[PDB]
Ligand binder design. Structure first.
Ligand SMILES: *[C@@H]1O[C@H](CO)[C@@H](O[C@@H]2O[C@H](CO)[C@@H](O[C@@H]3O[C@H](CO[C@H]4O[C@H](CO[C@H]5O[C@H](CO)[C@@H](O)[C@H](O)[C@@H]5O)[C@@H](O)[C@H](O[C@H]5O[C@H](CO)[C@@H](O)[C@H](O)[C@@H]5O)[C@@H]4O)[C@@H](O)[C@H](O[C@H]4O[C@H](CO)[C@@H](O)[C@H](O)[C@@H]4O[C@H]4O[C@H](CO)[C@@H](O)[C@H](O)[C@@H]4O[C@H]4O[C@H](CO)[C@@H](O)[C@H](O)[C@@H]4O)[C@@H]3O)[C@H](O)[C@H]2NC(C)=O)[C@H](O)[C@H]1NC(C)=O
Ligand SMILES: *[C@@H]1O[C@H](CO)[C@@H](O[C@@H]2O[C@H](CO)[C@@H](O[C@@H]3O[C@H](CO[C@H]4O[C@H](CO[C@H]5O[C@H](CO)[C@@H](O)[C@H](O)[C@@H]5O)[C@@H](O)[C@H](O[C@H]5O[C@H](CO)[C@@H](O)[C@H](O)[C@@H]5O)[C@@H]4O)[C@@H](O)[C@H](O[C@H]4O[C@H](CO)[C@@H](O)[C@H](O)[C@@H]4O[C@H]4O[C@H](CO)[C@@H](O)[C@H](O)[C@@H]4O[C@H]4O[C@H](CO)[C@@H](O)[C@H](O)[C@@H]4O)[C@@H]3O)[C@H](O)[C@H]2NC(C)=O)[C@H](O)[C@H]1NC(C)=O
Ligand SMILES: *[C@@H]1O[C@H](CO)[C@@H](O[C@@H]2O[C@H](CO)[C@@H](O[C@@H]3O[C@H](CO[C@H]4O[C@H](CO[C@H]5O[C@H](CO)[C@@H](O)[C@H](O)[C@@H]5O)[C@@H](O)[C@H](O[C@H]5O[C@H](CO)[C@@H](O)[C@H](O)[C@@H]5O)[C@@H]4O)[C@@H](O)[C@H](O[C@H]4O[C@H](CO)[C@@H](O)[C@H](O)[C@@H]4O[C@H]4O[C@H](CO)[C@@H](O)[C@H](O)[C@@H]4O[C@H]4O[C@H](CO)[C@@H](O)[C@H](O)[C@@H]4O)[C@@H]3O)[C@H](O)[C@H]2NC(C)=O)[C@H](O)[C@H]1NC(C)=O
Ligand SMILES: *[C@@H]1O[C@H](CO)[C@@H](O[C@@H]2O[C@H](CO)[C@@H](O[C@@H]3O[C@H](CO[C@H]4O[C@H](CO[C@H]5O[C@H](CO)[C@@H](O)[C@H](O)[C@@H]5O)[C@@H](O)[C@H](O[C@H]5O[C@H](CO)[C@@H](O)[C@H](O)[C@@H]5O)[C@@H]4O)[C@@H](O)[C@H](O[C@H]4O[C@H](CO)[C@@H](O)[C@H](O)[C@@H]4O[C@H]4O[C@H](CO)[C@@H](O)[C@H](O)[C@@H]4O[C@H]4O[C@H](CO)[C@@H](O)[C@H](O)[C@@H]4O)[C@@H]3O)[C@H](O)[C@H]2NC(C)=O)[C@H](O)[C@H]1NC(C)=O
Ligand code: BCZ
Ligand code: BCZ
Ligand code: BCZ
Ligand code: CA
Ligand code: CA
Ligand code: CA
Ligand code: CA
Lengths: 388, 388, 388, 388
C-alpha cells in the first residue's frame, strides 16, 4: 500500500545458509520443465519467486535443440514459485523478450523485457502487469539489461542498460522509473570503462550495483546510485581478489579506476556485497571456466586495492558447473536489517556438455546468517547421460 | 464495482510493441497443450487473458487427427493466463461451443458460445460464470459470432451475430446485452453487404467493428455502434489498401458502400483501428494465402477512397503462416487514452502443412507505442518435422 | 454468510441448453486424467464444479487395469473446475471412499464418503473441509448413498442412504444434517419398495428425490422430503413412461405405489423434474443397455398413471454410450426461479467395450431454457481404438 | 490473527476413520509425481496439507535410481493439498534439506529444514515463508529433527532435535521457538536414553512427544513438554505392548525408565496418544520389518508397566508394507475437544522391493471417532511389476 523505502543496513554476514534450489534439470529429465537461462530471484511484499528467460520449449522437447542461442522470438521472462522448477503449468510470463529485469516497489512490480533484432531492439516497461513505457535502441547493437532484479526507493527504481559493442566501448545508460514511467535517464559516468549485467541491492546508503566488464576487465565494475537525487558514480572493485570469469590469477594490487587486464572479450554476470568490514564477494572457483562457486569475506574490497580474504564459504565445487550469479534481498522481511541473498545459475548442456543439443540451468540460492554455519556444496545434480 | 464507460480516445499509434506470445505449438510438441483455433485476447479489470476454441484434445494426442474441422461437440471456449500456452491443466472453460465472444463490463464477464448442428444451432449467454439467456438460430444455417472480444459501455455490451449463407446474402443481427440479458436486437442496416467475425474496440465516440465479407468483398465491412442509443450503421473501409485474404492487388480507388470484387466465397477474420490520421490497418502480406502480417498507417482509411500508407510495421514475415487477427484493449489501464492492441493467430498444420493430421495455432499479440520502435518479426516457431 | 433457503419455484422448461462437457476420455488418451465413474455436478455460492469417484490411477496408467471394480481402497470423491477434465493436477479430494454425496448450505459445503469392506462400511461426514460426524453400517451390506448432490434448506441437508441387499428388501434411511452434525434420521416410509442412488433437487415446496429401484421396479421410486419438519414420504413415478434401465417397453398404465415388473436385480441412477405441467423425465433411449439419453416432457408424471410425452429432446444418440444421470441446480443464481440442470455420465470401456481393460467416463451437462432451442447430440467423443 | 492456545482435551477415541490417502505410487506410475519419503500431515487454520521430503526427481524419472539414500542436496520439505499426490506441479517447497518439522501457531507457519554434510549440518528456521533463525550442528554428526509436525501454544513452538550417534549416546536438545526466533533451548533430561524423530501432539495438559530409541530400546521414549514454563521431562512408555520396529515379542512387564532390550541400532518413527483410559498406541504388525499397522487401546500405557490392549483396529495388513507414522491434529476444528489423528507412511521400493532402483512412499491417514466404526485395511495399492 506504500512504496518501500531503503531504511536499513545490511545484516552482519558471518556465513551463508541455503535459501532455495529447484533441481530443474533433474526433474525436467521426466517432467514438462521449460528450458531456461539467465535466472534470478525477486521478492514481492508477500512472496519471493524464481525468475528466468524461458526458451519457449521443454528440455525433453525436440525444440530444445539449439537453445545455446541467446536471442530468439521464443524467449520470455517467466516467474514461478520459490524452489519449484519452471514448468509449463506453473510459470507466469511477465513479458516477452531475451533480456530482462524486474522489481517490486512496495505497491506493484515493474518488469522490463527487451526484444528485437540486434540492430532494432526495444525495451517494454511493464508495471502492475500492464505495459506502460517503451524505449528504443540508441546504439543499434543489442540493447540489453541486468538479468537480475532492480531495486526501488520511495517508488523510484533505477535500472542499468547497455547498448553497443560487447567487446569495446558501448553506450550505458541508467534509467529512473516510477510506476513504469521514465522520470529521467543518464549516460554512464565515472571510471568504469565497460558495463554489462549489473547485479544490484539497496540499503540506507543507496543502491549498489556490481557489473561485468566484458571488454578488458576481470575486476568488476561497480555503479553506485542515489535513488533520491537520481544520480550515480562508477568505478571498479579495488580488491586484487578478482571476481570475473575467465580471469587472471589474483595479484596483490587491484585496480580501482580501470580494467584489470589479462582476459578480453568475455566475462560472467556476478555480484558482491560491499559494506566495509562486512564485505563479501562471489566468484567462480575456476579462473578458466564457469565451474565452482565461492563467497569470500574481503574487508573494504570496494576501496582497498590490497584487500585479501579473511573468511570464505564454498557454494559449488569446482568439479560442478556454475554460471551467472546475482543479488537480491527480501526488503519486506521483519527485523532491523536487510539479509543479503544471492543465487547461482547452474548451467547444464552446451557448450561444455555437448553430447546433448540443449542448454539449460537450475538454480541454487543462499542468504546470509549471523551464525557461523557449516558449509556444504550444491551441485545441479542431474546426470547428463540420462538425457542421451 | 462500477460498469466501465468508454471515456477516452485512442493513444497515438507511432509503432507497435510486443505484448504477448505463447509459443503453444513449440511447447505442445512435448507438453499437454490443447489443440485450438480462433484465439483472441480479452481483459478483466485485474487481469488480461488468452482465449480460444479448444478442440477437446492435445496436439500429441491421437484425437488431434481431424482437427481441421470447424464445428464438433468437443469444442469449447477456454481462457488461460497471458502468454502461457493453453494446457489441459491451466485452461478455464468459459462455455461449450464452436463459435464465441466474451467481454468484461467492469463488474463481471459475459461469455457467449454457440453450439449445435448447422440447421439447429443456439447461443448461450453466460454472465458472471452462469448461463443467463439463450438465442435460437433464426436462419437455420450455422448461427455464428465474432471470435474476438466484445466491448461494453455502462453495462451495455453489443455483439454481432450472423446466421445464413457464408457465400451469399445472410441474416446479420446486432444484439445488445446487459448482465447477460437481451435488451434489444437489430437487423443489419447500412451498406455492408455481408458480415462475418467482427473485430471490435470502443472509445468515447462509440464502438467500431471491422468485419469479414465472405461473399463478394475483399475490402472489409465496418459496423459502427452507439451503445447508448443502441443503434448502428455499416459501410466498408473506403481505402484501396485492401485487407481481406485472399484478395486482389491494391487499386487506387477503393469502395465505401459495396464489396470490392475479385475474390468470392472466402476471407479471413481481421481488424483495424479507424481514428482519422491515427488510423492503422492490419493485413496478411500475401494476397493469396494466410501468410505474413503487417500493420499499415493509412490516414482516414474509413472515409477516404484514395488513402495510401504513410508508415508501416511488419509483424510476421510472408514466409511464416498467419491466420485470424482481431482487436482488444485494456480498458482498465491507467492514463488518459486507450492503448490499441491486437493479436494474430499463427495457424500450423492443415490444410497448408498436411504431413501432420492436425490443425492448431499459437498466438502473438502487440499493443501500440507512442515511440517509433524498431520492428522484429514473430513466427510461430515450431518445426513441423518434429511432429512426424 | 447466510444459509440458503429454497424460496423459488422451477423455471419453465421449454428446452435444454448445453451447460458443461469435459471430454475427459478424449483428453485422457494423452494427458494425466484420472479414471473416474459416478460423476455429478454441484454448486457453491461462487462456483460450480464437477465431482466424481476417482479410481486412484490415470487412464493411460497401467493401474487402470481392473477399474470396472466398484469399491476399492483407492477411490475418493474428487472435485474439479467445471468442464475441465479430472486431472491429477487440478482435482481436489473431498474425502476418501467409494460412494458419495456433497452439497453447499450457503455457508459451507458438506461432503460424505463411505468406505470399508462390504460387511463393515462407514460414512464420514465432512463439513467445511473437516470431518465432523461418522455413521457405521446398520445392515452390514455395502452402506451406500446418492452419487449426486444433496440439497439444503436453512442449514438442514437431508441425505438418502441404503444398507442391505441390492437385489431384495434393504434398509433405507433418510439422515438430516446441519453443519455436518446429525439432527435426526428416519427409516424409509411410503410405498417405494427399494431405494438406490437418489437424485435430488429443492424448491419452495420442498426437496424431491428420484431414485433407482434395483430390485423389481423399472419405474423410478420418488422420495419427497420436508427439510423443515424433517419428514418424508415415498412412492413411484405413476407415469407409464418408464425411466430405469434396463426396462420393459412403455405400457399405457404405470404404477404409483409398487414396482413396475419385467426387469429384476438391475437399474441405473437417473433423475426427473416433477413439477405439474412443467414435468420432465430423463432416460436412456435403449431399454436394454446404457446407451442414448433423452428428456421427455410428461405432464404430471408423478401423479398421473396415464401420462405420455408432449415434447422431448435428444441428449445422446442411442448409438453412443451413456450411464448414470442426476440433478443439480445453481441455487445461488440471480432471478426469480431455479433453473433445472442435469448431467449424464458417458461410460467408456468395460464391460461393453472390452478391448480395453479399464472403465471410465466423461461428463455432459445441460440446464433448462425458457426458449425452444434446437437440439444436438453429445457423445463422449473418444475413439476406443486409439487406446489399443 | 491470534496465537492458538491448547485449551481442550482429546476427544474420546472409540475407533478410527479414514481421513486421507494419496495413492501416490499408483498415480506416479504414469504421472509426474515426486519421489518422497518421511511424510507427515499438518494443519493451518484454514487448510490441512500433506508434507514430505522430496528427492528432487519423479518416480518414472531416471534420477529415481538411488533414492534409498537419506541425505542429498536434492531433497526439500514440500507440502501439497490433502490426499493429492506430491506432483511437480502442485507441490510447494517449504525449505531445503533432508530432515524437517513444521507447524502453524495460529498466525503463521514455522518450517525447519536441516541440510549439510554429516559433520557440518545446519538447521534453518522459516517463519511466514521467510528464513528467520539458523542453528549450527553441535555434535558434528547428522543434526536431525522430528519428521512430523511440531505443536504450538500461545506462539511458543517446541521442537526436538538430536545430534550425535544414531547407535549410541547422542546430544538431544529441545528448542523453544516463537515467530521463528529462539527463545530458549534445553539439553535432554529425564530417563529416556536415546531420542529420534519425535511425534508430538498438544492438549490442555501440555505437549506430548513419542519418539524412537534407535540405540537399545524397543519401547518408545516419551518427552513431555510444558510450553509455558518451557521445560520438559522424559521417560519411556511403561507398557509391555512394545511399539518400535524391529522389536522383541511383547512381555508382561515393560520398562518405564530404561530401554527394553532385544534389538539394537534400529527402529522406526512412530507415535502414541497417551491419555489415561483413552490411550491408544500405534505399531507395525510385524516385529521383524516395516509391514502392517495397527492401533491398540492400552489404558494408562504411559504409566502402567502391566498394561495390555482392550480394543484394537487394523490399519494396514501385515502383508502390506508400512513405514514411518506420526501424530497431528486439526487444532482449529470446531467443538469441545481435539480429534486425534495420525498418518502412516507406506514405503515402496528399496530395500525390500529391489527389482526397482527407487524408494518412495504413499500416505494413509486416520482420525478418531467417538463411534465404534467398522475397520478396513489400507494398502499403498501399487503393483511393483508395472514399474519393471
Ligand atoms: C565446517 O564448516 C565450516 C564453515 O564453513 C568450515 O570452516 C571454513 O573452512 C573454509 C575452508 O578452509 C574457510 O574458508 C577459507 O578461508 C580462508 C581465510 O581464512 C584463513 O585466513 C585468514 C586470514 O589470515 C591472514 O590474516 C591473519 C590475521 O590474523 C593472519 O594471522 C594470517 O597469518 C594471514 O595473514 C585467517 O584469519 C583464518 O584463520 C582463522 O580461521 C581459521 C579457520 O579457517 C582458524 O583455523 C584460525 O584459528 C582462525 O580463526 C584462516 O587461516 C580463505 O583464504 C580461503 O579462500 C582461499 O582458499 C580457497 C581454497 O580453499 C580458494 O578457493 C579461495 O579462492 C582462496 O584462495 C585463493 O585466493 C587467494 C586470495 O587471492 C589466494 O591468496 C590463494 O592463493 C588462492 O588463489 C588461487 O585460487 C583462486 C581460486 O581458484 C584463483 O582465483 C587464484 O588465481 C589462485 O589460483 C577459504 O575461503 C572458512 O573461512 C571456514 N569458516 C569458518 C567460520 O571457520 C569447516 O572447515 C567445516 N568443517 C569440516 C570438518 O569440514
Ligand atoms: C528498424 O525499425 C524501424 C521501425 O520499424 C524500420 O523503419 C521502418 O521501415 C519499414 C520498412 O521500410 C517502413 O514500412 C514501410 O512504410 C512505407 C511508408 O513509408 C514510405 O512512404 C511514405 C509515403 O510517401 C508518400 O507520401 C510522401 C509525403 O511526403 C511523399 O513524399 C512520397 O514521395 C510518397 O508520395 C513516406 O512518407 C516515407 O518516408 C518517410 O519514412 C522513411 C522511412 O520509411 C524515411 O526514410 C523518409 O525520410 C521519411 O521520413 C516512406 O518513404 C509503406 O509504403 C510500406 O508498405 C508497403 O511496402 C511493403 C513492402 O515493404 C508492403 O508489404 C506493404 O503492403 C506496402 O506496399 C504494398 O501496398 C502499397 C499500397 O497499396 C502498394 O503501393 C505497394 O505496391 C505494395 O503493394 C503490393 O504488395 C501488397 C502486400 O503484399 C499487395 O497487397 C499489393 O497487392 C501489391 O502486390 C512499409 O510499411 C516503416 O514505416 C519504417 N518505420 C519508421 C518509423 O521509419 C527500420 O527500417 C529498421 N531498421 C533497420 C536497419 O532494419
Ligand atoms: C431442431 O430442434 C428442434 C428442438 O429440439 C426439433 O424439434 C423437436 O423434434 C423432436 C423429435 O421429433 C421432438 O421430440 C419428440 O416429441 C414427441 C412429442 O411431440 C409430439 O407429440 C405431441 C403429443 O401429441 C399427442 O397429443 C396431442 C395433443 O394435441 C395430439 O394432438 C396428438 O395427436 C397426440 O395425441 C404433439 O403435441 C406434438 O406436436 C407438436 O409438436 C410438433 C413438433 O414435434 C409439431 O410438428 C406439431 O405441429 C405440434 O406443435 C408432436 O407430434 C415425443 O413423443 C417424442 O418422443 C418419442 O419418440 C422418440 C423417438 O423419436 C422416442 O425416443 C421417445 O422415447 C418417445 O417415443 C417412445 O415413447 C413413447 C411413450 O411411451 C411411445 O409411445 C413410443 O412408441 C416410443 O416408445 C418406444 O421407444 C422408447 C424409447 O426407446 C421405449 O422405451 C419404448 O419401450 C418403445 O420401444 C420426441 O421426444 C421435440 O418435441 C421437438 N421440439 C420442438 C420444440 O418442436 C427439430 O426437429 C429440429 N429441426 C431439425 C430440422 O432437425
Ligand atoms: C467390523 O469392524 C469391527 C471394528 O473394527 C471389528 O471388531 C473388532 O475386531 C478386532 C479384531 O478382533 C478387535 O481388535 C482386537 O482387540 C483385542 C482386544 O479385545 C479383546 O480382548 C479384550 C480384553 O480382554 C481381557 O480383559 C477382559 C476384561 O473383561 C477379560 O474379560 C478378558 O478375558 C481378558 O482378560 C476384551 O475385552 C474384548 O472383548 C470385547 O470385545 C469383543 C470384540 O472384539 C467382544 O466379542 C466381547 O464381547 C467384548 O465386548 C476382546 O476379547 C486385541 O487383543 C487384539 O489385538 C491383539 O491381537 C491382534 C491379532 O488379531 C494382534 O495384531 C495385536 O497386536 C494383539 O495381539 C498381540 O499383542 C498382545 C498384547 O501383547 C499379545 O497378548 C498377543 O499374543 C499378540 O502378540 C503377538 O503379536 C504381536 C503383533 O504382531 C507381536 O508384537 C507380539 O510379539 C506377539 O507375537 C485386536 O486388536 C477390535 O477390538 C474389535 N472392535 C470392536 C469395537 O469390537 C469386527 O470384527 C468387524 N466385523 C467383521 C465381521 O469383520
Ligand atoms: C552479446 C551480449 C552478451 C552480454 C555481455 C549476452 N546478452 C544478450 C542480451 O544477448 C549474454 C551472453 O552472450 C551470454 C553469457 O555470457 O552466458 C548470455 C547472454 N545474455 C542473454 N541471452 N540474455
Ligand atoms: C461457415 C462459416 C465460417 C465463417 C465465415 C466459419 N465459422 C464457423 C462457426 O464454422 C469459419 C471458417 O470456416 C474457418 C476459417 O475461415 O478459418 C474457421 C471457422 N470458424 C469457427 N470454426 N469458429
Ligand atoms: C451394489 C450396489 C450398487 C448400486 C445399486 C453399486 N454401489 C456401490 C457403492 O457399490 C453401483 C453399481 O454396482 C454400479 C452401477 O450399476 O454402474 C456402480 C456402483 N456404485 C459405486 N461404485 N459407487
Ligand atoms: Ca571480463
Ligand atoms: Ca472476402
Ligand atoms: Ca430396476
Ligand atoms: Ca529401537
Amino acid at each position: 500500500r506504500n512504496f518501500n523505502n531503503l531504511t536499513k543496513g545490511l545484516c552482519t554476514i558471518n556465513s551463508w545458509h541455503i535459501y532455495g534450489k529447484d533441481n530443474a534439470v533433474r526433474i525436467g529429465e521426466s517432467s514438462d520443465v521449460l528450458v531456461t537461462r539467465e535466472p534470478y530471484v525477486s521478492c514481492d511484499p508477500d512472496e519471493c519467486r524464481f525468475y528466468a528467460l524461458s526458451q519457449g520449449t521443454t528440455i525433453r522437447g525436440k525444440h530444445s535443440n539449439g537453445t545455446i542461442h541467446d536471442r530468439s522470438q521464443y524467449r520470455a521472462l517467466i516467474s514461478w514459485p520459490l524452489s519449484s522448477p519452471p514448468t509449463v503449468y506453473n510459470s507466469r510470463v511477465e513479458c516477452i523478450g531475451w533480456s530482462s529485469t524486474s522489481c517490486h516497489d512496495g505497491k506493484s512490480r515493474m518488469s522490463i523485457c527487451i526484444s528485437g533484432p540486434n540492430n532494432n531492439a526495444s525495451a517494454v516497461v511493464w508495471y502492475n502487469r500492464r505495459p506502460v513505457a517503451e524505449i528504443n535502441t540508441w546504439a543499434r547493437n543489442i540493447l540489453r539489461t541486468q538479468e537480475s532484479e532492480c531495486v526501488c526507493h520511495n517508488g523510484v527504481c533505477p535500472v542499468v542498460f547497455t547498448d553497443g559493442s560487447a567487446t569495446g566501448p558501448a553506450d550505458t545508460r541508467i534509467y529512473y522509473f516510477k510506476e513504469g514511467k521514465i522520470l529521467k535517464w543518464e549516460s554512464l559516468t565515472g571510471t568504469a570503462k565497460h558495463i554489462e549485467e549489473c547485479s544490484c541491492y539497496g540499503e540506507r546508503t543507496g543502491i549498489t550495483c556490481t557489473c561485468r566488464d566484458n571488454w578488458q576487465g576481470s575486476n568488476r565494475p561497480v555503479i553506485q546510485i542515489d535513488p533520491v537525487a537520481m544520480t550515480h558514480t562508477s568505478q571498479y572493485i579495488c580488491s586484487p581478489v578478482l571476481t570475473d570469469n575467465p580471469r587472471p590469477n589474483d595479484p596483490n594490487i587491484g585496480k580501482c579506476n580501470d580494467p584489470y587486464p589479462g582476459n578480453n572479450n568475455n566475462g560472467v554476470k556476478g555480484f558482491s556485497y560491499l559494506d566495509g568490514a562486512n564485505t563479501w564477494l562471489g566468484r567462480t572457483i575456476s579462473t578458466a571456466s564457469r565451474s565452482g562457486y565461492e563467497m569470500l569475506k574481503v574487508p573494504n574490497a570496494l576501496t582497498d586495492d590490497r584487500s585479501k580474504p579473511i573468511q570464505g564459504q564454498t557454494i559449488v565445487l569446482n568439479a560442478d558447473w556454475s554460471g551467472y550469479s546475482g543479488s537480491f534481498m527480501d526488503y519486506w522481511a521483519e527485523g532491523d536489517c536487510y539479509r543479503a541473498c544471492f543465487y547461482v545459475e547452474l548451467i547444464r548442456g552446451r557448450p561444455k556438455e555437448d553430447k546433448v543439443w540443449w542448454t539449460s540451468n537450475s538454480i541454487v540460492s543462499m542468504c546470509s546468517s549471523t551464525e557461523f554455519l557449516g558449509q556444504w556444496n550444491w551441485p545441479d545434480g542431474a546426470k547428463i547421460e540420462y538425457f542421451l
